[PDB]
């Protein structure tokens, strides 16, 4: 029979800007920061009993290569007996790590696990295919920071290779999400994040990154100075007849997060504090060219299976890849554009979105918000490049 | 409460040599080959019901970048509504995809899934770190084909960054596995593989790869003319006092594989043939410098939990990354060096080892051997770079 | 006080290989050294520590030809470390510039005995990557240096354009009204004449072979690889233009990209006597000219006019004209501007770069040495070699057989 | 055969010399080379520019934005007519001096009348290079830095002659010629002191045209050489660590640096001087080159100077200025000692040299010729010698006479 699974302690680094405060920190070292903090914060745990470290990471070409979960656990000082595995569902990878950890415990195969994710987009490398012939004249370098590389002509002909901003424009057009509404959403994100930062809400989630000594402690991507007037003046990324701008989109960023999941038996054995029970995770696919609407089938699949209406959640943490798609998703699910339970502390337009980290951040910040507000059920959901969505539901204990 | 999970149809490409028969085939296209074959071979399936495609891939920097599972299912012609996720546990990735798919169905979250793996080591790209400073003089290209890149000094100082063949020499030394015994094992691998090829055993597992037209239909890596005399003449990789040679080690290779897993209800609805029930998966960690011994703790953990003795398995598919470690593993588990149930059709010394594919191949070939021999329980297990092992048990229906 | 006479003595070249072909395995520096080693073997009366300078032409200099390939080559060839070397770059005219620069050094009395030559390994030309301009730059790019533009300056493009070499040849065909049919007929004559000269052993007299290692033993590369002796007018007419259906330049009426090296000794009269050399021609002079980049193939016209005006020699007075065949369109346009018939018997009598290939840095040295070889075989007196240059130049050099 | 023609250096100008990654690092090498050419146009309105016979430019690298004959790229960018030809010369650090002497030979032999000679290097912007694959799916691809020194090493070169770095050659010169760390540091200090004094006196300002640099709120100008360390003391030099390890003598403080800059000058026959209203400033007497073992390349000037002075029948002691390239204090001192000139002889580098000023490879030799002439003007001296070392074992020397 199935086992209940509890999220326990959870922690994250600050999120850095591209080329900013964390740009010097290798991805594997960055991933190790939250793992080391979990060790320090949870002295009752017998660490050689960790069954697995599951980490999300979208890139894996740079210093996050060759299974960054295992690299990170060894750099964190966890025993060499502890296994690790790295998951890739692009911007959803960190959420997938939590849900995969959940499934491993629920199915009785493990008792005590760490789930998290990482991305260093600053340090994403360039890649060069091998020569396909002697003295080939066709060598090319490609940036892996974000988006398409090594484009397959068959993918392009069948589905297109729209950039992520192009897809967000496509959602704005197809779902009729105005520029004005996008900018209003982006402003609320900045305003709510600024409030939460000043209130110390993010500080409770954050462990500092030491750079050897400089100490990085605050989320750097926020623009509390944002006004509607300033957003209105920005030019769309893809031309004047379009709507997505740098100001109504998330950024490219660096960060890591991690949390402990445990069975009821492991909670007691390790002296953990159970904070939420995981209820379930679901995934859904959509057309690549409207990848931002991906959350809608994921949320519907998960909520229909669990028998929970979207309106039953006390917090919804909806990834803000682009305001156009966040608004489109809310509208498809029948939730108001400014519904109080949605992103109450702001989201990725203010905070940034290091791909592999962001899904683990959404879960842990949803739990944090449930604790602050005394709410019960929380939903975290996010879109995925090339047309998917992922949704995960928790309940505060 | 937990749900039974069945492996149904399974298929793979042939395994190509580095720069050989499949070197022209992009990893995403190669992954799509077994997916398209599963469609052809399973006409009762309603394909928009597939809940997830899980695929193993160790590299993810090349044409396998950005979640090859999803790229591959789209290229295969599967509906865009089907989600996919890519797993990385180095050489164990494909086995992890199977076990992860299993946990998703056992826990009641899914009903019908595809699990598999891919690697194109021929086409693994070079990588180049970003400049850390304007006008940096420290740019560098690294090969991603196999092994360490972007070495972390903290990893080197504490754990070492031994190459995989160095770790195999370390295992040979620490576990006293002689050169003569390694060569005897390598010879049996080539003999058994040559016999299985001739009997049409691999042909039953293989779907051809069509290259624009050349049809690739046979495993390319086999050396059926191998003699003990020829292996004896070979020079060790790591110098004259070492024992691991190119003749007693797996190679660098290209290939892909995939299989269907389903709940009993999905078996019925989609007219599938249930072929084995998945019993469980376990992982284990060891010192990186002796990563070849990693299957030992994985196998022990799995069999202790299931209450199955290693001697109860009718087939053991033990990954042959190196003869030294295959022998060491067998000896620690109390199984003879030439036990008839171990790798009865040969293994990666003869067949090659595209990292992300190999673990999916071991599961499907274990099941295939059970059907041919009338055996009941099968074990597949393998080591993992940087010191892990993975083990998965199945039972023919 | 007076200038000194300057004599070309021995000259030798490698065969010309195709891109990725017979010489593709040979490093550009090693390749440059092959004709130098042959000059040493062929001229045993020379006191080698009296060579004043080695001048070598090389258009690329980013690969194994980097950091002054003249000096690398002379060291690799076994010449004494006391001999200086300098590398010249005027793109496809580099090797001719090395000869004329060597000539000027002796004529002005500053040197007595020199080697001039040129090299290119276009097979082995590397890729180049600019440095990052900022920390964590997302703007890194590789560019091929085999031929043509890289690191384009926006100011060059806006003022002069950055037409590819074949585009410039189509521009010459358009502006100077040179038909596809005439281009193809010229290319056919080049192939026919080169096939005839190869059969006659004419190229063999110029060539030192290059030894290459195979798995089972060694082979010798002895023959120019680029020739297409089977070429016919029908074969040329079927080819598609490089730049699209309304254009005229094809791979069959254009030079190729190729590998090779060449070198020759130049000496004052006193050095000829002292070192036991055989003087073969006197150098008369060299001139350079500029034109619009976008019609760079017409470059030889002002160069030839400048040289012949200064020397007081009519173009029709030359017994051989070696005119580089970068493209049939520009070869024809130059001949027409100069009042020479498209098929005049004294022009390219042994064929040219359409048949033979054109390793940039080597080609100008080959044109001088082959003009001299042709004068000797034919009993001619004066020879003119001239060639075009990317980004709009011409170079011309005149000699007179002794 | 007719008579040789006398050759005159006329106007000459240069950019400031920028540090690596410093004031001129944003400026492409081809645009940088165009800066002194545009200034020569502005400064000499008497000249009929379509009569320039050739632009000769030195450049050691030629793989970056200086590719494909930077002399021709630069003259077109400078606004000179497309009828003017150009050619680029490469003798590494001597390239710019080679341009001047090559221009001299072309006019002396009667082949030209009016020419520009100069040199450029942007070592900041020197690219990386990558050889082509020799085989399909090759696993052996490599990037190499072209900023300075060996790349694409030939095993035959290494076996026979070695592939010592330039600082390693300077250590080899210190060892074999017995040039002490103390003497090297004393030489380096004198270079900084003399350069500081010349800068303050406005001496470099007379040679310099400013370079304009893009900036977000309006372009800025670079007016001054950036490399100078006027506050250097003997104590600071004494404390530096050697480049090549603890027991050696060459340091960053007694070596030239890696730098950016360009320079150019006009050379003309007597007839061209008249026709174009130019001021003849010096006659070029001659140039000579010499080779030495690669491993002690810094001693290259010795055979070059001896060859030149023997032919011209001028003693080293007859020169009123000697501009000796300061690639390394160790080689500078060794050369002087071999030539019988005191380590601190007043006519040697009176305004300092490359240790203080820096050394963009292609530019340096053009700078040495123009600064030698400048110094002869200031001092009233007659004959000047400029000479320098060349990587892989060469030296180049060029002599001029004022008026
Ligand atoms: S799950 C998350 C998945 N990840 C993504 O999809 C990542 C999406 N983000 C991106 O790809 C980029 O961040 C995009 C949206 C393409 C924007 O990048 P660009 O390169 O086009 O633009 P910049 O980042 O250079 O920004 C352009 C200018 O906009 C200004 N700006 C940003 N935000 C604001 C606000 N709030 N107010 C005013 N201005 C704002 C930037 O400062 C920049 O100005 P400059 O003057 O050019 O520096
Ligand atoms: S889960 C699996 C994880 N992956 C690994 O750990 C992969 C380990 N493998 C490797 O990294 C390489 O395969 C190693 C072991 C380093 C060897 O690489 P090579 O590139 O040297 O491999 P080749 O196939 O080219 O073989 C080397 C030479 O040995 C000869 N040889 C091999 N096997 C035999 C047999 N059975 N009989 C005779 N000769 C044999 C090869 O032919 C080759 O000889 P050459 O003359 O060099 O062609
Ligand atoms: S001073 C020298 C300056 N140098 C230059 O400007 C160099 C100019 N040359 C080039 O850049 C290239 O050589 C151009 C003109 C761009 C063409 O390059 P390609 O790589 O296309 O050339 P190939 O010869 O490899 O291929 C062209 C195809 O045409 C066929 N072909 C050529 N010539 C003939 C003749 N005489 N007869 C029949 N066919 C011919 C080639 O065989 C080839 O056909 P494939 O079917 O592709 O083999
Ligand atoms: S014809 C000319 C041919 N060209 C050459 O041979 C060029 C040779 N030069 C080089 O390759 C480099 O310049 C070498 C000699 C290798 C040194 O390179 P660096 O990159 O180390 O140079 P820096 O300018 O960074 O100097 C290193 C440190 O030394 C300190 N330092 C130098 N000079 C002084 C003086 N005069 N006084 C005090 N300190 C000095 C630099 O400040 C620097 O200190 P950091 O704290 O590391 O910046
Ligand atoms: Cl991405
Ligand atoms: Cl992002
Ligand atoms: Cl071109
Ligand atoms: Cl250099
Ligand atoms: Cl200098």
Residue numbers in the entry:
A (entry chain C), B (entry chain B): 0 to 211, 216 to 400
C (entry chain D): -1 to 400
D (entry chain A): -2 to 400
What did the publication describing this PDB structure actually write?
Structural analysis of the A- and AA-mutants complexed with CoA reveals a disulfide bond formation between the C90 active site residue and the thiol group (–SH atom) of the CoA leading to covalent blocking of the active site. This is an uncustomary thiolase reaction that is not previously reported. It seems that the H356A mutation (A-mutant) compromised the activity of the PcaF leading to a locking of the reaction center. In PcaF, H356 plays a central role in anchoring of the substrate, mutation of this residue leads to covalent locking of the reaction center. H356A mutation results in alternate conformation of Met 163 and causes the binding of CoA in an unusual orientation, exposing the thiol bond to the active site residue C90 instead of Cα and Cβ of 3-ketoacyl CoA consequently, covalently locking the active site. The H356A mutation also causes changes in the neighboring residues M163’ and R65’ (from another monomer of the dimer in PcaF). In the apo structure, M163 is located 6.72Å (CE-SG distance) away from C90 and 3.75Å (CE-NH2 distance) away from R65, whereas in A-mutant-CoA complex structure, the side chain of M163 moves 3.78Å away from its native conformation which is toward the active site cavity and this allows the R65 residue to undertake in double conformations. Additionally, the alternate conformation of M163 provide ample space for R65 to adopt double conformation. It should be emphasized that, even if the C90 was active, the covalent locking would not have taken place if the H356 residue were present as it would had caused a steric hindrance to the C2P-S1P bond of CoA. Similarly, in isomorphous difference Fourier map from A-mutant-CoA complex dataset, with peak height 5.6 σ–6.2σ were found at Sγ atom of Cys-90 from chain A, B and C and 8.1σ–9.0σ at S1P atom of CoA molecules in all chains, other significant peaks were near the Glu and Asp residues and sulfur atom of the methionine residues.
